[PDB]
Symmetry: none
Subunit: 324 residues, 6 copies
C-alpha cells in the first residue's frame, strides 16, 4: 500500500495493457515500451526525492534494504510486476533508475499462432548465412571497413574494440555507439564517466567503484536494447558471455590486447578469473567466445613504421559461428 | 490421533484399496488416483481452515513447525502413508496442497508377473529410434512445426522454450500447455503468477519469492504430478531439473533466455555449474545430461531487423544423440 | 575396581537367558530379533530357538545395562548402540524407533579363542579352497548371460537372486518397483538372515523368520546401513536409494555383502547409474571422488538393473523395459 | 639443563657411541640399538612420574607444550639428539614412549666403502626376482599357503588382511604377528586394544580416540622394525603408502573388502579422502598401492556353500612390482 | 563549485611550463622524464625540447597539486600517481623512490576532440592498412628463422631486437645475463622511448635520451609494470623475472607492448619456460590458470630465449648454449 | 653511513673491479670471487660483534629488524650492492654469514661478444648425449659404481641418496661430499649438525629448528654457492629444491627416506604436493620436473635378511629421460 502510493504517478502506463515496460531513468521522465518500441513522456511530478522514497518503500515491502551500501534492488510488486531499482552510487548521480516489467497475459492456441505466420520462418538447417551476414562478409571482402562497422552496429553484432594501451579504443567505441539508432534503450557500465549519450534520450549510466559483474546481472532485469560495458578486465567476462548468450545482442565493449587473436586469448584468461568460469575446460571457454563475439576491431599505435593510429585487423568469422 | 481426526474427511479414499494417491489441491475438492487415472470428488466440509489445522497437526506429529517461513512439509503417518503438505506462501493463496501416497501392499511372484505379460515386452534396445521418435522426426523433416510441437507435448517430450527476454516465450509455453490432456495432474513452479490452467482442474500452483525453485522441484517428487511446469530455468535449479527429469518425470515444459538453440544448452550448462553438486560434474558430463534429458528446444525470435516479426527461428530435436 | 565390577554384574544379569548360547564354543553369533526367540550361527548356518522367558522388557533392560557399561544412553533419541561386553563379545543393539515396534534387535559377535597360530588355521581347513587364483574370465555368470540372451528374463531374475547378484529395481514413481522388489525377495532362500531398511513398512517377510526391520524417520538410512555391518545379515534390503546413502551402499557392497536388492527412481537403466552417481555426490566423502571413479564403483558393485515401465501411454501395461547386466565391464574394470 | 638432568638415567647408553638409539617404552626399562640389534636393560630408577617430567622439561625447552591435548612431542636435544615423546592418551596408559636418535658421526671415503664390499651387491637391472621372491612364488604355486604366509612375514612383505565384516581379520592379523621374530621392535596403532604382544618385549601401543594418520607420522621418528596399523579406513591410507614407500617394510594391516581386487579398490577410495591423496590421478594411486602392498589375504565367511570361514584368495604379484 | 575551481587553478598553475605542448592539437603525448626537458609524441614520433625553467621542485609541486585534485597523496611512501586532469588529460606521475633520484616522471595522455564519427576515421586513413587478414603463415619471421638455421646468431639477435621480438636472457647466476641484456639494448633504435624496471641501477641508457628508470625496494616490480601501461613506452625493460610479476609481464606483452627484453635464472631454455611457469603460479590470478594455459601464454608472448653458460667447467668460457625460437608453435597455438 | 662504516674492513674487495662477490662466512675471514674463482683473505679486525652490528645497521637502512626471530636479511646498499645476511640461529653459532653481490657494469656490443667467441659454441641440441653423460653411462654399464659416483660429483650431477631410516644415507652423502673440489663454495642446510666440512674452508652451515629448510633454500639463491647440500628432503621444500636446481644450481647432493630408487621419485612427488605451488602442478608435470632436475639416485640397503649387510642395491641414472 505504501508501494502502491508511490507508484501513483505511473498509473497511466502501468494500467495501459498495451504497454509491457515502464522505465524511469531520471527524475521528470518516463519511458514506456509499447509493441517493442519506446515512448517518451514528461512527468514533472516525479522528483528525485520521490524516487528515493519509492526505492525505500519497495525495499521495506520485502526482506530488504536499499542503500548506498546496497544500491541495487530487485522486488516483486503486489500485482505481479517485477521492479528493478538502481540508486545514486551504482547509477548516475541525481538519478534513480527504475524498471517495471509487467506480467504477460497473452493467450494464443497453436492454431492462432499458425494464422499469425508463426511457423513460416523456420530456418531449416543449412550452414547458409542470413542475408545480413552475407552483406557484412561482402563489405569486409570489398575492404570497405567503415561501412562494415556501421552495418555491424546496425545489424546488432557483438563488437569488441581491441587495442594496445593508449590506442583510442574508447573513442572508437564512442564512434560506433553513434551508429546505434537513437530510439533504442542503452545502458552503460563503467567506472569513470566517458560513454556519454547526447543523442540517446532513453539511457542509464551504471557505475562501479558493486562490480561490473553485478551491474551486468542487473541489466538482465532492466530491458536494455544494448548493454555497453566500457571495458572487460576480469571475471565479468564470464557474465558478459552469459548476458550475450541470453540474447542481449548489439553489445559494444573494449579490451586491452595486442591483436585480434590476443583479444580472445586475454578474454579467456579473464573468464578463468570467475568461479564458474574456472569449471569450464579451456576449449569450451574459447568456443563460448566465438559463439558470442561477432567482431573484433583492433586499434594499432603505428610504431614499427610511423603510420600512426590505424586499424590493423578486423576479425569477423560467422562461418565458425554457424558451424560451432 | 490429532492428524487422524483431520484425515477423516478423506477416509473413503484412504481406505479404498483401489486408490493409490489422495490429493487436495484447494479447499472443497479431492483428486484420487485409481489405476493411474485421476478422479474428481467434491468434498464440501474440507475448508481452508481444516487444511491449515491438518498441516499443523501433522507437523507436531513429527515434531516440526509449519507457517509462512516453513511452508513445505514432509511426513509419514502412523498407517504408513507419506504426506506432502505445501501451504500458501509456497502455494497459491487461500490454498493448501496435500498429497498422500499410500503404502504398496501387492504381493506377486515371478510366475504371477510372467502370466500377466511382465516379461513379454522387453525391447532389444537398438539405436534405431522408437516409433514415436520416427513420427516426430518425420514431422520436423516435413516442416510441419505446428504438428511437431503438438505431438511432442502429447508424446511427453521435455521441451525448453528459448528466446531473448520479451520474445514471447511464456505465451508459447502457455500455448504448448493447452496441448496437455486435461485429465493430467499439473504442477507449476513460478515467481510471478502467469501459467494459469483454466482447463486443467487437477493442478497446484507453487510459488517462490528459504523457499526456492529448487526446493519446489524437490517437493514435486513427493506430489505425484504427471508433468512439472517450471516457468523458467535461471540458475542452480537446472541441476535439480535434470535430476527430476532423469528420475522419470517427463512431459516437462520450461523456458530459458537464450540467443539460439545451441546457446540454450550452453546457458543451461552454466546454470548447472551454479549448483554445489553441479560443480562436481565435468563439463562434458553436464552437456551429456542435458542431451539425455532435453528432447526439444524451440527458439523464439523477435524479427526486428528483417521486419519479420514474432516467429520461431529453429526447432532443435535430435533423438539420435539421446 | 568395585564400580566396574558392579556394572559388569548387571549386564551379565540381563544376559542370563542367553547364557546357553553364549557359553557354547561351537556357536559364533547370537541374535535376538524379537521377544521370545533367538537365532544362532552354528557353522555359517542359522538355528532357531524358542525362549519364552525373554520378553520385550528384558531386552530393554539389557540395552540400558550395556549402555551404562560403556557409559552411554540407549534412549528413544539414541536407539543404536555398539558395545564390547566383559567377556569380549561385540554387541549391537537397535531399539524401537529405529527397529520394528515391540521388538529389540540384539547381535552378539563372539571372539576366537581357538585360531591363534597359522597351524590352527590349516587344521580347520582355512587353506583348502584358496584354489581360485581370481579368474580373468567369467565363471558361470555365463549361465546368467545366456539366460538374458535367450530372453528368459524370469529365470534370469530368479537365478540372479539365488546367485546373490546386487540388484537395483528401477522405474518412475508408481511403476511398481516395490512390488517387483518384494517378488524378488521371495526368491531369497528362507534360511538366510535379512535386514530391511525403510521409511515406510512395506517389505514384510512372512517366509523369512530370521529378519530385522530397521526404520529411519539422527537416525538415517545411512546410519542404519552402517549398523548392518555389525549385525550379521546374509543380505541387506534397502527399500530405496535417494541421496548420500548411495555411497554407504557402495561401501557396504564393496565390503562383501552380496545379494542386496534395492530400488531407485529412474527413467531407464542408464539413467539409474546416472542418478546413483548424483546421489553419491551428496555424500561428504562421495564428493571427494572423481566422477569417473564414482561411475566405476557403481559398475563394480551393481550387477543388475531392472527397469519397470507403466505402459499406460502405449497401452502396454505394467512391464519391464530393459534388464541391464554386464559382468564383462565389471570384469575389464576390476582388472584394468 | 633441566632436560639434561632428566636424561641422567640414560647416560650409559646415550654416551655409548656403539649405540644409535635409546628407547623407553614403559617405566622401568630401556631398549637400545647397537649395530641394528636391540638390547634390553632394566632401569628401575625410571618411574612413570620421571618420564612425565622428562616430557614437560623437553616441551618447555622449545616453543612447546606437552599434554593430554598434545600428547605427541618432537624435539631436538642440546647435543643434537632427536627425541620423540608420546604420552598416555596417545600411548598405552601408565607408560610414556621415548625415542632418542643420536647424530651420525661415521666418516668413510669412497675407498673405505669399496674395501667394505659396498659396491659388490648392486642388482644390475633384470626383471629377475630376488631369491626370497622366487621362494614365495613357489610356495604359492605349490599351494602351501600356510608356509607362504609365514615366509611372507619373515621376508617382511607388506601384508593386508582383507575380509567381509565379521570375518576374523584381526585374529588372522594376530596369527601373522606371531611369525614376527621376537627381537624386533613393534609399534601398534589402534583405537581399542586388541593387538597385544606378549612375546615381543620391545613394543609401543599407540592409540587414537590425534588420528591414525598423526600416529603413523609419529612412527617415522620412533625407529620401529614394523608398524602394525590395526585397520585402514580413510585418509590414513595415504600416510600408510608414504610410510611404506619410506622403507618401513614388514607391515601388517587390515581392510574391510569383499575380495582381493576390492581391497585395492577400497584402499584407493581411502587415499582420495586425503588432501594430498586427492591430487594424485587415480592410476597413480593404484600404482602406489601395487608398489607398496606385497600380499593381500582375503578371509571369506563361507555362505554360498556352508564351508565356514576360509581364505578365498591370496594375492601376490611381484612381477608387476618389479616392472611397475 | 569554488572549492573545486580553486583546486583546479593550482594544478593549472604548475602545468604552465608545459602549456605550449598541452595546447598544440598535433601533439598527443607530453612527457617529462627529468628536470629540464620534455618529450612529446608528434605523429607516433618523439621530439626533444629543452625547458630549463622546469626544475625538480616544479615537478614535486606539480605532483602534490594533482594529488590534491583527486584528494590523494604523492608522498615518498606513495610515489605512483594516476589522475585525470581538468581538461581531460590522463596523467601518470612517478616520484624519486620509485624512479631515478633527482628526477620525476610525468606522462600526460591527451584526449581526441577530432575522431567522433566513423567518417572522421576514414579521412585520416585509419582504414587504409587493414590489409593483413592475419596470415596463417610466417611473414618474415622466416628471415629470423633462416638466420638461426644458418647459424648466424649475432645477426639473429640484432634482427630480433630490431623486429621487436620479446627476448628472455637466460642463464645461471653470474653467467653474464645482465651484460648480454645491455648488449641487446644497444640494438634498440635510439629514438624509442624506454622504461627500465629494476632493484639495482644497472641498465643505464647513455644513447637513449628518452627513458625513465623505475625502481622497487608497497612498490613492486609488478606495480611498476602496471604503471608502464600508462606511460607511453616503446619497450619495457624489466631487469629480471623472479616471481608473481611474470603474470603481469605476460599481460603487458599480450596487451601489445612488443620488443621487451628481460632475464631469468635458468639452467637451459626449457628450464626457463619451466621456471617462468612456476613464477606465474605465485600470482593470485596466475594460480587460477591451468598449467597448460600458463605454458601456452608463455609461448604466445615469449619469442626468443637466449641461454648463457659460463664455460669454466670444460674451459669453454663465456658462451651461448642455445637460442630458442619457434614462431611455428606460437603460430599453431594462436590458431589452434 | 652506519652501514658504510661497518663495510670499511671490506673496502679493498668492494672497490676492486675484478671482484664480483665478497663473502664473510665467519669472523676473521673473507672469501672473494675474482673471475669465477674464490680467494681467501685473513681479516683480523672483523669480529663476531662487528658483523652483528653490520647486520643491524643494514636492517635499519631498509627499515627492518634482525635478531633471533628474524635471522635472514636481504638488502640493497646505496652503491647498488645486494647483501644477504644470515645470523646465528639460522647459521652456525658464533658465526654470521654475509654475501655481497656487486653490480654488473660491463659494456660489450654484439661485435665484442663475437670476436671473443660467444657465438662459436652454440650446440645443435641433439638427443645424442653429451660427452660427460656418455662417460657416466659407460661407468655404470661397466659396473664401476665407485668411479661412477666420484665422476657424478665431479661432473656436478644432482644426486639423491636414498634408503630406509638408519641405512647410512648421511654417511654416504658425507663420502660423496669429499669428492667435491676443496675450492668450491658450499652451503649446508640441516636441522642437526652432521655435514661437517673440514676440507672445504669456504662454507656456511645453515640451520632450521619461521625459519624452514625452504626459506634457507631461497636464501641460498642470494648467497653465491657452488653447491647446496640439503641434508634431507621431507616435505614442501622438495618444490623449492626443484626450483633452485632448475635455476641452474647444480652439483647438489641430498637424501630421502625411500624403499627403492623408483619409490624415491614416488615420495619426492608427494613432498612437492605439500607445497602451495606444488599442489597446482599436475602429477605428470611434477614427475617430469623431478626427472629434469634429478640426475642420480643411489639407494642404500641394510642387507638384513640375506645377511649381506650395508650395501648399494641400485644406482639410477637415465640421461635419456632428461
Amino acid at each position: 500500500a505504501s508501494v502502491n502510493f508511490h507508484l501513483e504517478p505511473l498509473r497511466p502506463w502501468l494500467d495501459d495493457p498495451q504497454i509491457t515496460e515502464v522505465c524511469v531513468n531520471r527524475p521528470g521522465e518516463v519511458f514506456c515500451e509499447r509493441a517493442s518500441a519506446w515512448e517518451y513522456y514528461a512527468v514533472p511530478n516525479l522528483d528525485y526525492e520521490h524516487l528515493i522514497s519509492l526505492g525505500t518503500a519497495t525495499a521495506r515491502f520485502v526482506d530488504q534494504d536499499i542503500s548506498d551500501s546496497r544500491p541495487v534492488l530487485s522486488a516483486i510488486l503486489p500485482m505481479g510486476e517485477r521492479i528493478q531499482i538502481v540508486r545514486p552510487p551504482a547509477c548516475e548521480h541525481g538519478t534513480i533508475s527504475v524498471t517495471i516489467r509487467k506480467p504477460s497475459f497473452t493467450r494464443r492456441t497453436l492454431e492462432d499462432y499458425a494464422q499469425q505466420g508463426f511457423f513460416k520462418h523456420v530456418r531449416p538447417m543449412s550452414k547458409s548465412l542470413t542475408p545480413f551476414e552475407q552483406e557484412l562478409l561482402a563489405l569486409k571482402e570489398a575492404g570497405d571497413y567503415m561501412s562494415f562497422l556501421r552495418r555491424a552496429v546496425q545489424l546488432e553484432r557483438v563488437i569488441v574494440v581491441a587495442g594496445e594501451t593508449g590506442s583510442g579504443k574508447t573513442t572508437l567505441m564512442k564512434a560506433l555507439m553513434q551508429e546505434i539508432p537513437f530510439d533504442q534503450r542503452l545502458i552503460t557500465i563503467e567506472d569513470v564517466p566517458e560513454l556519454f549519450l547526447p543523442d540517446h534520450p532513453n539511457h542509464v549510466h551504471l557505475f562501479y567503484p558493486v562490480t561490473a559483474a553485478t551491474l551486468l546481472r542487473s541489466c538482465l532485469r532492466m530491458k536494455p536494447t544494448r548493454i555497453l560495458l566500457a571495458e572487460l578486465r576480469g571475471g565479468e567476462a564470464y557474465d558478459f558471455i552469459n548476458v550475450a548468450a541470453s540474447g542481449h545482442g548489439g553489445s559494444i565493449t573494449s579490451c586491452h590486447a595486442g591483436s585480434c587473436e590476443l583479444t580472445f586469448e586475454r578474454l579467456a584468461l579473464m573468464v578463468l578469473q570467475n568461479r564458474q568460469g574456472r569449471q569450464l575446460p579451456y576449449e569450451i571457454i574459447r568456443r563460448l567466445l566465438y559463439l558470442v563475439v561477432d567482431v573484433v576491431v583492433h586499434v594499432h599505435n603505428g610504431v614499427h613504421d610511423g603510420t600512426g593510429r590505424h586499424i590493423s585487423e578486423v576479425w569477423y568469422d560467422p562461418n565458425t559461428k554457424r558451424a560451432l
